[PDB]
Design a protein around this ligand. Structure first.
Ligand code: SF4
Ligand code: SF4
Ligand code: FES
Lengths: 56, 230
C-alpha cells in the first residue's frame, strides 16, 4: 500500500481483481515477536498410580 | 538319573537337582535380570531384581537363590513379574545421582540397560536423594561411593577370592556405607579385578578414568604376557 491513486487505478483496471485489499506485502499482521513464554501441557501420561509400563 | 522337570514358560526341560532357578532359565536361554548374582561368587539375595513368578503361588520368589522342587512351571513374562521388576527398578534409581554424563561406565552400566529394557518411563520421588562421602580405596582404584547401589559384590569377591577382608558394610537403613572403616589403602593382588565386578560406576579405574567411552573403542582378542598362565 501507501501508493498514489492513479497507479492504483491502473493496477485495478489492468487486472480486474480490486487488487488493493490483497496484494502480498505484509505490513501489520506480522505476528508480534517476543511472545509471552509458554507453559506446555502434559498429555495422557504422568498420572500417578496408574502408569505401569506393562499396560502401555 | 537325577532329573527334575521344569516348565520354563510352559516349555519342558530336565534339570539336575540342587541348581538355582536362574541356571534353569539360562539352560533354556532366558535371562532373568540381576545385579548381585554373579557366576563366580557366592549367592546373596541383596539386589532383589531377580524376582520371578511361579504358577499357583501367592509370593514372588527370588531366582538367584531358590532350589528346584519337582515339576515347576515358571512365568518369566507374567503380570506381577513385570510389576515387581518395574517396582525394584523404580526403587534403585532413587538414591542414585545424576552422573550418567560424568560417569565412567556410561556405555557399559547395568542400571541403564535394565532401566531401558525392563523399567518404567516416567519417574517419581520429588524430594530426597541421599549423598554419601566417598572413600579412597587405593591409588589404582578411583572410588565414588555416591553411585553405589549396595549390591555387596565387592565384599563377597574380596573375602572369597582376594582373601583380604578389608571391605565391610557399615551402618543401617539408608546409611549403609560400603568400604574400609580405618582409611586403609586396600592394596593386594587382584585389586584391579574389582572394577569389573562392581556393576555400577562406583569402583572405577584410576588411570583409565576420564579418557574414553565404550561405544567407540573397538574390541580385539589378545593373549597376555609377563605371566606364565597367559
Ligand atoms: S553407574 Fe550407571 S546409573 Fe549411575 S551414573 Fe553411572 S551410568 Fe548412570
Ligand atoms: S561398591 Fe559396587 S560392588 Fe560394592 S556394593 Fe556398591 S555397587 Fe556393589
Ligand atoms: S540376584 Fe537374586 S537378589 Fe540379587
Amino acid at each position: 500500500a501507501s501508493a498514489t491513486r492513479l497507479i492504483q487505478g491502473l493496477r485495478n483496471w489492468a487486472s480486474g481483481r480490486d487488487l488493493q485489499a490483497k496484494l502480498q506485502l505484509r505490513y501489520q499482521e506480522i505476528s508480534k515477536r517476543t511472545q509471552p513464554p509458554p507453559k506446555l501441557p502434559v498429555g495422557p501420561s504422568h498420572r500417578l498410580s496408574n502408569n505401569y509400563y506393562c499396560a502401555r | 538319573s537325577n532329573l527334575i522337570e521344569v516348565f520354563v514358560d510352559g516349555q519342558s526341560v530336565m534339570v539336575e537337582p540342587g541348581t538355582t532357578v536362574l541356571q534353569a532359565c539360562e539352560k533354556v536361554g532366558m535371562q532373568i535380570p540381576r545385579f548381585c548374582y554373579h557366576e563366580r561368587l557366592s549367592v546373596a539375595g541383596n539386589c532383589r531384581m531377580c524376582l520371578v513368578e511361579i504358577e499357583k503361588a501367592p509370593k514372588v520368589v527370588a531366582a538367584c537363590a531358590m532350589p528346584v522342587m519337582k515339576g515347576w512351571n515358571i512365568l518369566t513374562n507374567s503380570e506381577k513379574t513385570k510389576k515387581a521388576r518395574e517396582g525394584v527398578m523404580e526403587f534403585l534409581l532413587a538414591n542414585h545421582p545424576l552422573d550418567c554424563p560424568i560417569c565412567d561406565q556410561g556405555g557399559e552400566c547395568d542400571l541403564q540397560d535394565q532401566s531401558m529394557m525392563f523399567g518404567s518411563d516416567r519417574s517419581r520421588f520429588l524430594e530426597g536423594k541421599r549423598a554419601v562421602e566417598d572413600k579412597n580405596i587405593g591409588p589404582l582404584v578411583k572410588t565414588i561411593m555416591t553411585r553405589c547401589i549396595q549390591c555387596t559384590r565387592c565384599i563377597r569377591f574380596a573375602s572369597e577370592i582376594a582373601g583380604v577382608d578389608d571391605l565391610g558394610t557399615t551402618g543401617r537403613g539408608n546409611d549403609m556405607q560400603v568400604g574400609t572403616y580405618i582409611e586403609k589403602m586396600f592394596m593386594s593382588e587382584l585389586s584391579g579385578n574389582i572394577i569389573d565386578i562392581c556393576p555400577v560406576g562406583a569402583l572405577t579405574s584410576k588411570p583409565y578414568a576420564f579418557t574414553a567411552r565404550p561405544w567407540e573403542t573397538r574390541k580385539t582378542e589378545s593373549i597376555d604376557v609377563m605371566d606364565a598362565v597367559g
